[PDB]
Design a protein around this ligand. Sequence first.
Ligand SMILES: *[C@H](C)[C@H]1/C(=C/c2[nH]c(/C=C3N=C(/C=C4\NC(=O)C(CC)=C4C)C(C)=C\3CCC(=O)O)c(CCC(=O)O)c2C)NC(=O)[C@@H]1C
Ligand SMILES: CCC1=C(C)/C(=C/C2=NC(=C\c3[nH]c(/C=C4\NC(=O)[C@H](C)[C@H]4CC)c(C)c3CCC(=O)O)/C(CCC(=O)O)=C2C)NC1=O
Ligand SMILES: CCC1=C(C)/C(=C/C2=NC(=C\c3[nH]c(/C=C4\NC(=O)[C@H](C)[C@H]4CC)c(C)c3CCC(=O)O)/C(CCC(=O)O)=C2C)NC1=O
Ligand SMILES: CCC1=C(C)/C(=C/C2=NC(=C\c3[nH]c(/C=C4\NC(=O)[C@H](C)[C@H]4CC)c(C)c3CCC(=O)O)/C(CCC(=O)O)=C2C)NC1=O
Ligand SMILES: CCC1=C(C)/C(=C/C2=NC(=C\c3[nH]c(/C=C4\NC(=O)[C@H](C)[C@H]4CC)c(C)c3CCC(=O)O)/C(CCC(=O)O)=C2C)NC1=O
Ligand SMILES: CCC1=C(C)/C(=C/C2=NC(=C\c3[nH]c(/C=C4\NC(=O)[C@H](C)[C@H]4CC)c(C)c3CCC(=O)O)/C(CCC(=O)O)=C2C)NC1=O
Ligand SMILES: CCC1=C(C)/C(=C/C2=NC(=C\c3[nH]c(/C=C4\NC(=O)[C@H](C)[C@H]4CC)c(C)c3CCC(=O)O)/C(CCC(=O)O)=C2C)NC1=O
Ligand SMILES: CCC1=C(C)/C(=C/C2=NC(=C\c3[nH]c(/C=C4\NC(=O)[C@H](C)[C@H]4CC)c(C)c3CCC(=O)O)/C(CCC(=O)O)=C2C)NC1=O
Lengths: 161, 161, 161, 161, 161, 161, 65, 27, 160, 160, 160, 160
Amino acid sequence: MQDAITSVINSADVQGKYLDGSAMDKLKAYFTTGALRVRAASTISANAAAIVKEAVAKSLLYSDVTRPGGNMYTTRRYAACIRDLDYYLRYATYAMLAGDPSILDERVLNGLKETYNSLGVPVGSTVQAIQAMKEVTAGLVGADAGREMGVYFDYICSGLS
Amino acid sequence: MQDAITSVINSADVQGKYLDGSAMDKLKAYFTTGALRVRAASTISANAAAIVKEAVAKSLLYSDVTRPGGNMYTTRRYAACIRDLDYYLRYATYAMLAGDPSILDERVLNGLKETYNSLGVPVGSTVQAIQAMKEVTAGLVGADAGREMGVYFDYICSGLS
Amino acid sequence: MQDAITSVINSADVQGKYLDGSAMDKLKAYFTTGALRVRAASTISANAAAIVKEAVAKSLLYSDVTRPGGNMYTTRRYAACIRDLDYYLRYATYAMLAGDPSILDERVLNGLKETYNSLGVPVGSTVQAIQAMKEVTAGLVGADAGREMGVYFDYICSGLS
Amino acid sequence: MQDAITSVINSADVQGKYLDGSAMDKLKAYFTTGALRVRAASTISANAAAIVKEAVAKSLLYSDVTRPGGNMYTTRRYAACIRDLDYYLRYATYAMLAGDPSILDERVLNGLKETYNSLGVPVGSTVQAIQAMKEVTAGLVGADAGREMGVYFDYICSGLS
Amino acid sequence: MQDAITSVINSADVQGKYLDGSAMDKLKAYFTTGALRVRAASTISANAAAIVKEAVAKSLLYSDVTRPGGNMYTTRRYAACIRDLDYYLRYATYAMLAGDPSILDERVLNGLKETYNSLGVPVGSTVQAIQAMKEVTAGLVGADAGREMGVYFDYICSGLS
Amino acid sequence: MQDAITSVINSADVQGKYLDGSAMDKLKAYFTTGALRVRAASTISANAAAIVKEAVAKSLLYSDVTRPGGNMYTTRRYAACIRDLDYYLRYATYAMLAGDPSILDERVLNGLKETYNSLGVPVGSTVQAIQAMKEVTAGLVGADAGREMGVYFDYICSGLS
Amino acid sequence: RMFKITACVPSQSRIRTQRELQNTYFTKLVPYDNWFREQQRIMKMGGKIVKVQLATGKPGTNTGL
Amino acid sequence: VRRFRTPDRVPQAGDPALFLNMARSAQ
Amino acid sequence: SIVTKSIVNADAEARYLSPGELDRIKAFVTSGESRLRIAETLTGSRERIIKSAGDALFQKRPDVVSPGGNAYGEEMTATCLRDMDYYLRLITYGVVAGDVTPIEEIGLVGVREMYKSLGTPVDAVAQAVREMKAVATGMMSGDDAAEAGAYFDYVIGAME
Amino acid sequence: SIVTKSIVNADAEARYLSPGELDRIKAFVTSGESRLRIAETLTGSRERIIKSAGDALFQKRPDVVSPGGNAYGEEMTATCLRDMDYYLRLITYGVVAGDVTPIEEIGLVGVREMYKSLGTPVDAVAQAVREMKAVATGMMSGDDAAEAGAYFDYVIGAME
Amino acid sequence: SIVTKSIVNADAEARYLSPGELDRIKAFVTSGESRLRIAETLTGSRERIIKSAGDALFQKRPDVVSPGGNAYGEEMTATCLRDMDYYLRLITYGVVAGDVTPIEEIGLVGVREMYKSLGTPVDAVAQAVREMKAVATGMMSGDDAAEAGAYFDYVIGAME
Amino acid sequence: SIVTKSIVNADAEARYLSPGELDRIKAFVTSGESRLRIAETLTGSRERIIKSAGDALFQKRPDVVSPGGNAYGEEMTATCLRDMDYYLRLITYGVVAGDVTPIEEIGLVGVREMYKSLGTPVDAVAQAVREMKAVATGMMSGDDAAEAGAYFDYVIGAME
Ligand SMILES: *[C@H](C)[C@H]1/C(=C/c2[nH]c(/C=C3N=C(/C=C4\NC(=O)C(CC)=C4C)C(C)=C\3CCC(=O)O)c(CCC(=O)O)c2C)NC(=O)[C@@H]1C
Ligand SMILES: CCC1=C(C)/C(=C/C2=NC(=C\c3[nH]c(/C=C4\NC(=O)[C@H](C)[C@H]4CC)c(C)c3CCC(=O)O)/C(CCC(=O)O)=C2C)NC1=O
Ligand SMILES: CCC1=C(C)/C(=C/C2=NC(=C\c3[nH]c(/C=C4\NC(=O)[C@H](C)[C@H]4CC)c(C)c3CCC(=O)O)/C(CCC(=O)O)=C2C)NC1=O
Ligand SMILES: CCC1=C(C)/C(=C/C2=NC(=C\c3[nH]c(/C=C4\NC(=O)[C@H](C)[C@H]4CC)c(C)c3CCC(=O)O)/C(CCC(=O)O)=C2C)NC1=O
Ligand SMILES: CCC1=C(C)/C(=C/C2=NC(=C\c3[nH]c(/C=C4\NC(=O)[C@H](C)[C@H]4CC)c(C)c3CCC(=O)O)/C(CCC(=O)O)=C2C)NC1=O
Ligand SMILES: CCC1=C(C)/C(=C/C2=NC(=C\c3[nH]c(/C=C4\NC(=O)[C@H](C)[C@H]4CC)c(C)c3CCC(=O)O)/C(CCC(=O)O)=C2C)NC1=O
Ligand SMILES: CCC1=C(C)/C(=C/C2=NC(=C\c3[nH]c(/C=C4\NC(=O)[C@H](C)[C@H]4CC)c(C)c3CCC(=O)O)/C(CCC(=O)O)=C2C)NC1=O
Ligand SMILES: CCC1=C(C)/C(=C/C2=NC(=C\c3[nH]c(/C=C4\NC(=O)[C@H](C)[C@H]4CC)c(C)c3CCC(=O)O)/C(CCC(=O)O)=C2C)NC1=O
């Protein structure tokens, strides 16, 4: 768990060097993008349940997975699916605020593949659900904030696949 | 890999008993149905490519899976799909001739779910393709030969799902 | 954890279909065998300690495992062995009452092999002990109730081996 | 196994879209950097054994791993270590030429962690050896060619760790 | 966890035999050395922090590992290193008192190699630190008590390497 | 926690006698009430949320409590109020099923008085709400079981006041 | 917000050899959110709540607990 | 003639559409 | 079911089935014929139950079908009748199994969270099951209506 | 306020207040005039905000004002506007507090449970606070609208 | 592409890229600008290429459009125009990549098996790509027509 | 840092970042320029800070440099000035990060145990950081000296 600042400090410390001009430039880049990160995080905190339910309405609804036999069939499985998608959106917001995806592979992508493979959860359908969540939130917060959200959404989909 | 005769012999041997009247009646049932099995196998060997292409023309053609983004999109994927459907029809013919579905879970349904889940192959679309293949061959060989084909087609669809 | 009724309902629900005639016939089979299951469960609840001690007297007593160096040597190990055999008989009674061995691989056979392999417990000697327990209870409750007990005893021995 | 061109074509094909202006700009970026990639690949092909032996002379020589008890002790282990480092430099050259690290996780990083963990190979010492190889080749080919070599060297070290 | 007495009793019990003359001689050897073990344990309990800080002052101080980049760099890592060395001295005192190194591979050397290999802890530097701790405590308690301390210190260094 | 049965057994136990005919008379009185107790309990369990919402809509809604200035103003206090009412109704149903108000004196009215004094909860509004709930459940489930619920609600009010 | 509770709990379920005077009769501070669950737990144990204080609580306050 | 439009698939059990025709007739 | 519940309740207690639980299983085994008759009554007339219950629901709660409600439009009303069909199917499962662990263990655990995520008033769903109960217990004999109304009662109770 | 939250943070971490959060309290102290201006303009035009937002909510979601819905009748619509008054009041309290915690203590803990009791659709209340947010940020200047919209956004986030 | 082919061909041989392969990659890197110009020429005028090539094909081979022909009934001709569009898109991919591994690795491996399973004459498809080549090399300069006709030549050669 | 602390504090609470925390991150993002100016002030003049602070420390606490103390001799005094350089570097890190989690999470957790194992008086180290604070806040403007003295204050507070 480290943001862009802590990773820059960790690189300069593992070097043992002081903060040179490249580290200063990286921190200036983060300190310019931080206000946009803050406003996108507020806008995403506004519409958590709406983004999640629009992602299910785009991908998972009216398909086979909500029908009998699907892994999203029962009300318990539906509630756990909404819970999993809320987790993905919340941690993508955290990784957007930090500017570093270390929290994603520390706390989402750690044992997620083995959990989903033990439960029988389809990984492709949940990857499509995360992609639709990314599409909806990029329609919500704009072009560049949607892109800096979608880089961590693509990180979650890549670590899941 | 065992037909009805070998499974009856294996049951009587695992018992250690001789062939009693129930085994004789089971073998008489198989020896009455065998000529119909032979004629249906010849009729299915006649029209392999026609049954396969009519199954694709019923289910998979003009849908999203042959469009861009679908898993049946490219010519390599189309050729592999025709190959997979020819496999399903050929092994359903073998299980019809044996009168026992042991060859299906020995040699088709063994690692098929994990292969299709690793490749990204849709299982519902291929189950619908096998169902249309069953419908076409039951239109081909008649009512009761179509039923004794459809029991092994339903076995393949159940093991795939 | 599901009996024959809950597994039939789960199959018809994963299909999404109503209860057709085959499900009605399966439930009629269970509702005919249920009174015999009840009487065998009462007869087994009568003689728990007797069946366990006769199983040890048949297999494990006067062998090397109760001698020094054996895994059934000490009084702690003897008490834990009697506890394990009482568990096997109790859960075989439960699986006989339900008519489905889902409780056995849910709650006995889950981590039992790895536990016994970590402790150093001999699996062949405990499989012989469960087989003698099966032989004693099949002598107790009769032919067909002994058979429907022995199918779950063989399930426990197969999952243990 | 795909270069920058094949990955751009695969993205535009999975979209099903034609090559728009962003894909044209990505391919123009690759077609501008390709001559530098070619010259750096020739310069690295010049000095394979020198870069490998300077990497061992920087990191692994005169440490504990070449002493008795180390995993680089024997002549067989020394020859296999030189072979492994030659593999890392060769595949980093390939990934530099392609401009895409897909060959690295397809053909180096696939079962490398499990192989090294089964053999007892130290992963930190070989990561330091790859880092010294990167430092030597970045001293060889210059600043920017050394950087575009070091991105794939860091990819190999990240997948190994 | 067993001392010399419990291991002698366990050998005579796994035999099933009574305590013969060789066991009596082993217990007489332990009951002669026990007073020296007691006095050395008191002398080591006197100077725990002094022996630890003299071991760091001999080996680990003013080397690269306390410099930037070393694994003993930060104050957290320094405190954890002092904690690890205090553990080694405390458990070597326990194994000296018992006269059997079963506590060392039960409670120190169990997952210590895998822990140190996962953290990135240098095993050679900590082996040199334990060797300097052994040298200091053998200077403290004398020749033969230092030898019977150094046998368990060498046990810890052998299990760590 | 005692039923009518357990209180009869307890009273016959303190004086030390066996079961007399008057105890059997009380037991048959309990059974002939207990059948309709079961049906009233099912009716109350079916409609508990509507009963509580009608109770608060009858008495507490347009007063100063649900208004500002009362102890029912905030949503925290409203949720605590609805939870308190649900618990009164549930424990009244338990006392109706058992035929003894010992559960209300045991679990409800144990320390409820002093926490109601200490938090500043109005006793009179709670008593009015419970009595409104009493005739709501009386109009729901019927006359005789309405009296049954009536004496247990009155027991709760008398322990409260 | 915090309550002070003196409560006596008898072990009706089984005799306990070790000394349990600290377990049977005790006074402790309990947070307000944990107090509903703890009060329910003391109900289910069979112990009787003897004294409730809430000296810490400042009751009647909407804002600030 | 082989129209190229996508093949119709019969609704599976439990489908939302299955209750479309009655929902059109209902209030 | 009853057998699952008795087996589990004896299973945690490390004991066999008590004889009272055994005659409980025996009485359920004997009453299974009447349970199957109630199940055929509920299964064969599902069209009229769903149709009349949807009609009485939209008569009773017209705002959910008015523009602004959840079940507004053709496909939304079809999905509403589909959800009612799901709950009648779970009612049939609970009637056969002799206990509400099919109904609860399939379609009642996260029902609040699901209908909260869909934007659905759960009281109107309770009214839908109430009208289904009215049509269904209007369709049977007395004890059959009581035994089916127990499970309908459990569904409406588990809503609120 | 921000000071109570920084104090409970330094208490749970059992240390003094860091100079970062001392600088946060000092910056909050200097920005008191801007938040006073925002809460002043909101307390000025509360009736116009409530009237336009309630008519926009009833135009958007007519299920609540329909027969059979929750807010049907004169007194029910007046109580709906009273609840919007309470929420705008808590919005002003949180705007002047610098933190969302008085909005949490007074009106965010059990709103799902109590509106589950009354029968109010909570997503309709989220739409009402959405319309109040849109109208109040339409009234304010854009920077102050961003500040008030942060607290409004928090309320609709805790709603749905 | 060229870089993929050179990397793989050095990769099996357990050697680095030879300097001749390196100046091959360098010459392809320099000629990428003309490749992108040919790609824009082929991309921007795809409508006229597909239209005129379909017209000349059905003029040349009227039986596939004739009764009993595979491409019969407006959608069959129109459907064929989609297959011709696919092959022109693969031509553009092969023009950019500098090699035919996009064209072969996407749409030429099992082309015989696919068009035999569809009932299509493959010679008429070769005539379709021939007319596409005629219209496309009628649209460019000389060396551009030769460089595009190399890939068109590969497609017609891989048909038969 | 501030962003790490806000993310973690919202992360345990299973919620998003509250808007008050978001304007906290925004204010820290705006004040980062002054933080970088204080960091350049502390970085560029580290020689004079360490030299003058060591001089004033050994003037103030002469027993640690007298024979018998820890920092007696050439290399011991060099290691003492090196430890002071370490703490000034951590001060610069805490100035940039906006919070004391770099300083605490690197060089303040086991500082008592380490300096206890070395035989060092920790009060004299607190005096060393006090003299470093005197020289550093004698080097800046008023608000810059207050913002740097907050982190110097945290280091001396975490000593004792
Ligand atoms: C065209 C001038 C000739 C012709 C074409 C024709 N094609 C089809 C149907 C299909 N064609 C494909 C072909 C491809 N898919 C690919 O991915 C690629 C590589 C990019 C190719 C070449 C596929 C998949 C179909 C099936 C439907 C679908 O598009 O998903 C037809 C219709 C056949 C039918 O039975 O309806 C026709 C007529 N036929 C001619 O006569 C021309 C010579
Ligand atoms: C004899 C028992 C047996 C079977 C059945 C079998 C199947 C099998 N099908 C495969 C691929 C495939 N199977 C399909 C089939 C389908 N995808 C779709 O979209 C359709 C729904 C469906 C056809 C109806 C496709 C498209 C591929 C290729 C995947 C790819 O190339 O990426 C592969 C991948 C390797 C290869 O193509 O040659 C195997 C091993 N192997 C066996 O040994
Ligand atoms: C009682 C048996 C036992 C032992 C021995 C033990 C060791 C142990 N040492 C650890 C860390 C450590 N151990 C060291 C020690 C060293 N690194 C060096 O550079 C030196 C060579 C060497 C000291 C001489 C350090 C620096 C860490 C911290 C690693 C880190 O924080 O990243 C950790 C990581 C978790 C934690 O610090 O608290 C464990 C579990 N645990 C046990 O249960
Ligand atoms: C400050 C925290 C706080 C909240 C949230 C609060 C809510 C609250 N809402 C109420 C009623 C109500 N609130 C509504 C509101 C609505 N239903 C609709 O149709 C609309 C969509 C929605 C308006 C947004 C209605 C219709 C009632 C009356 C319900 C009834 O009488 O059954 C009442 C009952 C009357 C009273 O005692 O004032 C309270 C206490 N009180 C508080 O102190
Ligand atoms: C199983 C038996 C049992 C009961 C009954 C019980 C009650 C109980 N009621 C409480 C509060 C409460 N109870 C009420 C009650 C009311 N609202 C009013 O104003 C009316 C007078 C009445 C509604 C009918 C209120 C308002 C509070 C919360 C006051 C506060 O602490 O803010 C609390 C403090 C914790 C909490 O906030 O819930 C307990 C423990 N605990 C138990 O274990
Ligand atoms: C180490 C000091 C210490 C003591 C003494 C102690 C006593 C103690 N005695 C208890 C009960 C008891 N003590 C008695 C005592 C007696 N029987 C009589 O009637 C006589 C008057 C007397 C016999 C000599 C009885 C009957 C109970 C149980 C009453 C009940 O709770 O049912 C209990 C309640 C829990 C329990 O049931 O044991 C405690 C904690 N706890 C301690 O920690
Ligand atoms: C077997 C247990 C089970 C249940 C209950 C279940 C419900 C369920 N109801 C849904 C929709 C729905 N359900 C309703 C139902 C209603 N709205 C109303 O106003 C009426 C009060 C009520 C019915 C009478 C509506 C309107 C939707 C559509 C929601 C939307 O489109 O946003 C959906 C999403 C689409 C789908 O895949 O069907 C699910 C999964 N699924 C299950 O597996
Ligand atoms: C960044 C966090 C951090 C700190 C603080 C740190 C301290 C540290 N101080 C050391 C020594 C020392 N530090 C001092 C410092 C002092 N003695 C005095 O009298 C003065 C009061 C004071 C300085 C002004 C001295 C004298 C030693 C040598 C101790 C010895 O030789 O026994 C050593 C051992 C030798 C070495 O490897 O440098 C460490 C690791 N290391 C760290 O990573």
